[PDB]
């Protein structure tokens, strides 16, 4: 469960996911990568699920990198509460993925297993994923 160790402000304004890709746009640690095509909020739970899926379908020597990190927190008012009397308390952390950000990358294992691995990683995430390779 990826979680910031501490934050200066518990309840910040939400960060939009509409727009192009600011950073983490090109595979730069591995050479195959899973890009997103629709910005959305995805939480550390989906990240951990996808990472465990990748690790389970990896081998004995494959290596993986997680680019995105759930920096921003979000609140949720308790149920049966009418609006007012302040903001709700923070519940879960989501990493903000914009159209074009490479979330996971893999290397050091043959091509078919990595393609399958990225497929299973992307089926755990709501965004519609796509495979790209690293420029020589």
């Amino acid at each position: 469960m990826l979680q910031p160790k501490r934050t200066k402000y518990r309840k910040p304004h939400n960060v939009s996911y509409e727009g192009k890709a600011k950073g983490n746009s090109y595979v730069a640690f591995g050479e195959y990568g899973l890009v997103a095509t629709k910005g959305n909020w995805i939480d550390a739970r989906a990240i951990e699920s996808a990472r465990i899926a990748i690790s389970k379908c990896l081998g004995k020597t494959g290596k993986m990198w997680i680019r995105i990190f759930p920096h921003m927190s979000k609140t949720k008012k308790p149920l049966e509460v009418r609006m007012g009397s302040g903001k709700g308390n923070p519940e879960f952390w989501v990493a903000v993925v914009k159209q074009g950000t490479v979330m996971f990358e893999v290397a050091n294992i043959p091509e078919s297993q990595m393609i399958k691995a990225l497929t299973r990683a992307g089926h755990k995430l709501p965004v519609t994923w796509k495979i790209l390779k690293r420029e020589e």
Binding site: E80, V81, R82, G84, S85, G86, K87
Partner: peptide, 10 residues
Amino acid sequence: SKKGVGSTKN
């Protein structure tokens, strides 16, 4: 039922 609500401070 309202169940009551807390109070804001700022």
